[PDB]
Input
Amino acid sequence: RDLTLLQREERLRDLIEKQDEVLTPVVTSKDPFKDNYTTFATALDSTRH
Amino acid sequence: IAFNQIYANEFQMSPMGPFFQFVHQSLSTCFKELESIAQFT
Amino acid sequence: QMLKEMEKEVDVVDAVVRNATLNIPNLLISRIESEMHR
Amino acid sequence: AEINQKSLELELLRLEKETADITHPLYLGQKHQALQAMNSHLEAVLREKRSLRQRLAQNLPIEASYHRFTAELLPLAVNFIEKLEIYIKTIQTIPKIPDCASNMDN
Output
């Protein structure tokens, strides 16, 4: 039982570590993008009517 | 990042592409609308 | 959550991003002649 | 012995359920798709930066995404001009449209 549970936890850790490495840069640049994009889209939308 | 950079520098090749599209779509809709009114009568 | 909140904006932006013998009608000729100076 | 085996199985299944949102291929696949759609969209926006700039500020060197609209605009304009009188008559009939609808109903 102990060996089997340890093997599964190790696999889970490996998977989480690989994801953290790639998600951290995207979350940090999110808020400036969303705000710049929304302002841009609203400005563009006012020229079509 | 590339967008934010262009948004800060340029938004915040000739720039003519969007004018053509708009005029084309608006004019087409106008055509069809008038034809429909005539047909109803 | 960010991707879902930006859907409407994407659409607007997408909308923007995406033998010629001419018989001129008398009505238009009359208009062009009356405003010819302008 | 039998109880011990089943108990282990239960423990394993519970661990898998609790971490599925971040680990299972199904859920991870959905997140990929959402991200690819946005990428493509941004690529397009960057490709048409000049035209978009000109609009905000308001062979022929025109961005390829707009060739169609540019080529078709001529015929469309010609057609409109030629049918101008018909469009004007039609517009004059617009106040009769409610009467026309009532007579037809009768």
